[PDB]
Short mmCIF file of C-alpha atoms in Angstrom, two decimals:
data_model
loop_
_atom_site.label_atom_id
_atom_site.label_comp_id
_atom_site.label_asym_id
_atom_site.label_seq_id
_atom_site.Cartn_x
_atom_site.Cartn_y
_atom_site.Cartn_z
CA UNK A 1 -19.21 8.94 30.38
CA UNK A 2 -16.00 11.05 28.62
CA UNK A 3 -18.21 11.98 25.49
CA UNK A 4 -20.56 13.42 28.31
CA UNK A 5 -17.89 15.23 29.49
CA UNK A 6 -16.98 16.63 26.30
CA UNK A 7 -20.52 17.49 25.65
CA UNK A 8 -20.72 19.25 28.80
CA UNK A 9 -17.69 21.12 27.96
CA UNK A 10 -18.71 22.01 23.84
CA UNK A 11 -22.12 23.82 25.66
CA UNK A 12 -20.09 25.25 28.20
CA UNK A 13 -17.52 27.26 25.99
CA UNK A 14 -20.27 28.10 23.77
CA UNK A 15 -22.47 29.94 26.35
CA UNK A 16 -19.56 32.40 27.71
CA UNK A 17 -19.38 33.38 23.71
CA UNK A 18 -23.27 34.49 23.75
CA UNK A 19 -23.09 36.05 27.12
CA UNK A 20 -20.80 38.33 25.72
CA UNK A 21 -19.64 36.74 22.61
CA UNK A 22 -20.96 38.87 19.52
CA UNK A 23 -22.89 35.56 18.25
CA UNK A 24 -25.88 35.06 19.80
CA UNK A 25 -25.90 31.25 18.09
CA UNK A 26 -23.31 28.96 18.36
CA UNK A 27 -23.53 26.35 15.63
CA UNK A 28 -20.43 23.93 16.27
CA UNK A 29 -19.53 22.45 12.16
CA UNK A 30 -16.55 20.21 11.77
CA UNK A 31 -14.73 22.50 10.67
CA UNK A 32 -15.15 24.70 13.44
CA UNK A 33 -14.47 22.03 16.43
CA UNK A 34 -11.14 23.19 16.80
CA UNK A 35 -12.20 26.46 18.83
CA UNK A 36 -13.57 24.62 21.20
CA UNK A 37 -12.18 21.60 21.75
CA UNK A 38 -8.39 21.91 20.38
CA UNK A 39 -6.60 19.24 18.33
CA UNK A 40 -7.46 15.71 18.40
CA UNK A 41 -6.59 13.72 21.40
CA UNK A 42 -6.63 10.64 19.36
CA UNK A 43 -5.85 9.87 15.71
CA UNK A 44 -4.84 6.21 15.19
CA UNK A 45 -7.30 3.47 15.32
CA UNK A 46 -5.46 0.47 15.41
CA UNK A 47 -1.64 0.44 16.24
CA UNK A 48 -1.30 -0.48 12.55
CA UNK A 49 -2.24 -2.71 10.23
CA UNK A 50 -0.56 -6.18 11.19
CA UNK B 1 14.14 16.97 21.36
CA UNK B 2 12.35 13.87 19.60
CA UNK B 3 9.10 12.28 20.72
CA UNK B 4 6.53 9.80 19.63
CA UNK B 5 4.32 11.12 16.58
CA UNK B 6 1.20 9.99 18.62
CA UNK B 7 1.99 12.69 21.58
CA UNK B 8 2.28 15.71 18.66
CA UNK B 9 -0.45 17.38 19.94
CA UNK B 10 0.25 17.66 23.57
CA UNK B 11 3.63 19.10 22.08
CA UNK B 12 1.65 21.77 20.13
CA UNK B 13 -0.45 23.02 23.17
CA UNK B 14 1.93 24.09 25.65
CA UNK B 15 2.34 28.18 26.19
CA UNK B 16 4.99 29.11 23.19
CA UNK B 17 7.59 30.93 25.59
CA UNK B 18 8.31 27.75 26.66
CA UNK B 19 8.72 26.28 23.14
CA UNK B 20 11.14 28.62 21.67
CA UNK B 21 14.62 27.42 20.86
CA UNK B 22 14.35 23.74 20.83
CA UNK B 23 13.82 21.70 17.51
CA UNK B 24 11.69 19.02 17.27
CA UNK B 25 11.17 15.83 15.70
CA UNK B 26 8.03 13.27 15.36
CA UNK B 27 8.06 9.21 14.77
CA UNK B 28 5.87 5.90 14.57
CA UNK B 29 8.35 3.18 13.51
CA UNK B 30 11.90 3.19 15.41
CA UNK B 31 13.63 2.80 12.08
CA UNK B 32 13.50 6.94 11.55
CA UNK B 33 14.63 7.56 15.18
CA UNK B 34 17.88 5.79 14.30
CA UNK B 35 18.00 8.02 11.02
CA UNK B 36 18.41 10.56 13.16
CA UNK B 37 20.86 10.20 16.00
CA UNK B 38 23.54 9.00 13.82
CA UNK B 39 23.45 11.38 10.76
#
């Protein structure tokens, strides 16, 4: 359910940048994430190894 | 201020009036809090 969410929100942002934006194509790369989702909401995977 | 390394990014978000001034510091293990209060 979240990652639809997210999903939801990735093709969201991207449309108000063609309706106006100058690119007519958004291609999300890892790199560019950050624009449209901010900083990582999670890093760690495991609380640490024991 | 100090807070838990895991919350960073919330810390890095909010509007930056807010954030001027106040130092900050980040942590996982307790050990480098008490590193700090008692210099």
């Amino acid at each position: 359910r979240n990652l639809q969410k997210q999903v939801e929100k990735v093709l969201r942002k991207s449309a108000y940048k063609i309706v106006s934006g100058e690119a007519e194509s958004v291609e999300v790369t890892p790199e560019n994430l950050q624009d449209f989702v901010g900083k990582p909401v999670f890093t760690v995977e495991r609380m640490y190894d024991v | 201020i100090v807070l838990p390394a895991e919350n960073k990014k919330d810390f890095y978000d909010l509007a930056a009036f807010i954030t001027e001034g106040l130092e900050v510091h980040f942590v996982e293990h307790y050990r480098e809090i008490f590193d700090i209060a008692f210099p």
